[PDB]
Each structure stands twice: as structure tokens, then as C-alpha cells.
């Protein structure tokens, strides 16, 4: 299992948010921590992605693009997995120091997004997703959202995404298999609408932020103002398996 060997080897370790749990929850503190966590995870997505099989086949501009477009979906998927594996979906395990109960879901002003993410967490258990299926599905997620007008070297992308689909098929093969691929691609598709709702909520925050003084940190301000509106305006869209 060469491919799985590699994905296990490069999988990033635990990441903390730096949140102060000794203080009562407030929207401002929760958002600062999500911003911090978000940036810390992005660093690890970059390290991870550059070490993926084939990733350097991509034009460097496309390498950079695909990470920024798919980072929120990658974080959603992984957070769902941690929630399932660490606490049986009873809460959302953003980080060991940032665990959301329903009161935090509410205080974050992202209650609906949180509920949908808790549902995603429960599906890992209903579907009995294996840790090896998780790793293959997460890698495929990186190659699941791109500009409608194409990437700089579309052909290299196409062949890379193909290989990751072949490798998910591989560990499903290794019929029932048909049913399995359906269930897993349905779950993957469901990540994208959730990421979009996170993007919409945060884009709106950023715009109003001069009165709400949400001091958006530099990396986040750049990605929310430069890259996220491409997704919100439809110029960048997920690659769905099934029709929505």
C-alpha cells in the first residue's frame, strides 16, 4: 500500500488554537481564535500538500491556487473526522484547546454551519469510514475546487485528480464496492456547501469589520478579500461527483 504509506507519513500532527479557556466565551475571542487556528492549519496544509504524490507536476501558480481554494474544505473535513474520532461527534473538536459545545456554536454566530459540521462528523460513524479512507478522501479534496475558466496547466491538474480518484477506488476495491464509492463521493460533495457558508459568513464580517473592529490578521484579510470572492461570485466552483 505505497500510496497509503505516503499519506500516513505526511499527515500533519495536532494543532492548537491558543485559546484562553479560563475566560468566558465572547464572539470576539472565539473569532480571534478561529483566525489564529485557521492560519496555523493553513501552514500545515501547505507543508502537507507540497509533499503529496504528484503535486509538483502542477504549474506553481496552480499549486498555490488549489491550496487557497480548497483550504476551508480541507479544514472542515478534518475537523469533522477529529470530532468523530475523539468525542463521538458529541462536540466539535476544532483543536484540543478549542472544543465547541452548543453554547459555543451559538456564541460564535456560526450555529448553522456548526450543526452541518456535526452532521458531517456523525456520517463518518454511520458510514464506518476507515482512517485509510479518510486519508485518501482528504487528499482528493485538495483537487476538488477550481476556476470555471480553467487553471494555468489544466491538463496536469486533470491527470493528478484522476490519479487520486484511482487511489480512492483502489482502497475501496481492496458490487459492495460500487455502493461504497457512491456513499463516499456523496459525503465529499457535501463538504463544499459547508465551506461556502463559512466563506460567506466571514466575507460579510470582513466587510462590516470597520465598525465591528474585527482586526483581521494579514493572511486572512488577504485570502478573504482576494480569493474568497472568486468562490462567492461563482468564478471558482467545486468539482462535484453528483448533480446538486
Amino acid at each position: 500500500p505505497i500510496f497509503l504509506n505516503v499519506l500516513e507519513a505526511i499527515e500533519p500532527g495536532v494543532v492548537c488554537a491558543g485559546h484562553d479557556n479560563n475566560q468566558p466565551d465572547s464572539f470576539a475571542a472565539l473569532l480571534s481564535s478561529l483566525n489564529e487556528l485557521g492560519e496555523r492549519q493553513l501552514v500545515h496544509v501547505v507543508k502537507w500538500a507540497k509533499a503529496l504524490p504528484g503535486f509538483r507536476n502542477l504549474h506553481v501558480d496552480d499549486q498555490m491556487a488549489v491550496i487557497q481554494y480548497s483550504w476551508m474544505g480541507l479544514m472542515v473535513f478534518a475537523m469533522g473526522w477529529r470530532s468523530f474520532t475523539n468525542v463521538n461527534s458529541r462536540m466539535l473538536y476544532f483543536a484540543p484547546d478549542l472544543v465547541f459545545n452548543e453554547y459555543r456554536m451559538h456564541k460564535s454566530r456560526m450555529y448553522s454551519q456548526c450543526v452541518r459540521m456535526r452532521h458531517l462528523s456523525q456520517e463518518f460513524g454511520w458510514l464506518q469510514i476507515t482512517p485509510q479512507e479518510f486519508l485518501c478522501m482528504k487528499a482528493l479534496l485538495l483537487f476538488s475546487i477550481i476556476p470555471v475558466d480553467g487553471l494555468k496547466n489544466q491538463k496536469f491538474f486533470d491527470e493528478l485528480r484522476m490519479n487520486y480518484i484511482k487511489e480512492l477506488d483502489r482502497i475501496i476495491a481492496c458490487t459492495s464496492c460500487s455502493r461504497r464509492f457512491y456513499q463516499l463521493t456523496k459525503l465529499l460533495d457535501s463538504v463544499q456547501p459547508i465551506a461556502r457558508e463559512l466563506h460567506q459568513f466571514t466575507f460579510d464580517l470582513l466587510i462590516k469589520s470597520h465598525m465591528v473592529s474585527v482586526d483581521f490578521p494579514e493572511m486572512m484579510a488577504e485570502i478573504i478579500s482576494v480569493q474568497v470572492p472568486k468562490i462567492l461570485s461563482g468564478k471558482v466552483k467545486p468539482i462535484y461527483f453528483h448533480t446538486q
Binding site: V43, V46, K47, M64, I67, E218, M219, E222
Partner: peptide, 11 residues
């Protein structure tokens, strides 16, 4: 940009 700096800083 910030993201490009970060991407380029990773081996």
C-alpha cells in the same frame, strides 16, 4: 502577497 511568502518559505 502574504500567502505567496508563506508558500515560498516551505521547503
Amino acid at each position: 502577497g502574504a500567502f505567496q511568502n508563506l508558500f515560498q518559505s516551505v521547503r
